[PDB]
Amino acid sequence: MELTEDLNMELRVFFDTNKSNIKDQYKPEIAKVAEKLSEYPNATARIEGHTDNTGPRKLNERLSLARANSVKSALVNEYNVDASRLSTQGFAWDQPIADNKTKEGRAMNRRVFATITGSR
Amino acid sequence: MELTEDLNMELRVFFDTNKSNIKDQYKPEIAKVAEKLSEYPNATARIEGHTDNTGPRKLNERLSLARANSVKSALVNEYNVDASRLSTQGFAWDQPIADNKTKEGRAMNRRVFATITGSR
């Protein structure tokens, strides 16, 4: 008489230097997230944006948030997901997941990680 | 894209005095359990039967297990659910959830509680 299905989903989107646009190769992933947000109407998403450590501090604070908002925007405007179900926050270069000393590491740091959770 | 869905279900079936048959009113819930067991192929169920504290101990040890096996049998025979995914155990009157001093309390104890868990 009690039935619960819990959703746990993790999305990773990476960005080009000084850019906050969603590259086409991530559209399929974002579409999958929108699908689950539809299948789990009560689920919410925690979207967090980041940057590598290159450039002015404020540029990165703004860019990291712009990246998170770009992902939210895709869900909201392309998939009609209720905006209030998604939070966005930028962390500039404060939470690296790779070595900023290499191009490859910096590329890993220019990212948006989103955690989608909820039950139905 | 990390994505998982976890299933957690609890089925509660109640029985009349000395009976181990599945009342028709519980068929819809058993049907739902079968549905989820198919939707989550790795899911398993822990079926536990119980009795009120009236009558011989040997009667209730057998009766509690019979009730659990009745639920399992319904799933196995009517819904083609693999028997090995379903465990059954009887607890006689050792695990009451209501006061056996009253008729409604004893009605609550004559039960089978099934916990279904799975992931996909």
Curated annotation (Swiss-Prot), chains A, B:
Residues 2-120 form the OmpA-like domain. Changing residue 67 to A: Periplasmic domain no longer binds diaminopimelate. It is found in: Cell outer membrane; Host mitochondrion. Disruption phenotype: Significant loss of the bacterial outer membrane, not as able to induce apoptosis as wild-type bacteria in human cell lines. Meso-2,6-diaminopimelate binds at residues 18, 52, 54, 60, 67. Functions as a porin. Induces apoptosis in human cell lines through caspase-dependent and AIF-dependent pathways. Purified Omp38 enters host cell and localizes to the mitochondria, which presumably leads to a release of proapoptotic molecules such as cytochrome c and AIF (apoptosis-inducing factor). Binds peptidoglycan, contributes to cell wall maintenance. The periplasmic domain (residues 221-339) binds peptidoglycan (PGN) and diaminopimelate, one of the components of PGN. Homotrimer. Forms a pore with a size of 1.3 nm. Live A.baumannii and purified Omp38 elicit identical effects with respect to the induction of apoptosis in human cell lines. Belongs to the outer membrane OOP (TC 1.B.6) superfamily. This is Outer membrane protein Omp38. The gene is omp38. The chain holds residues 221 to 339 of 356 of the full protein.
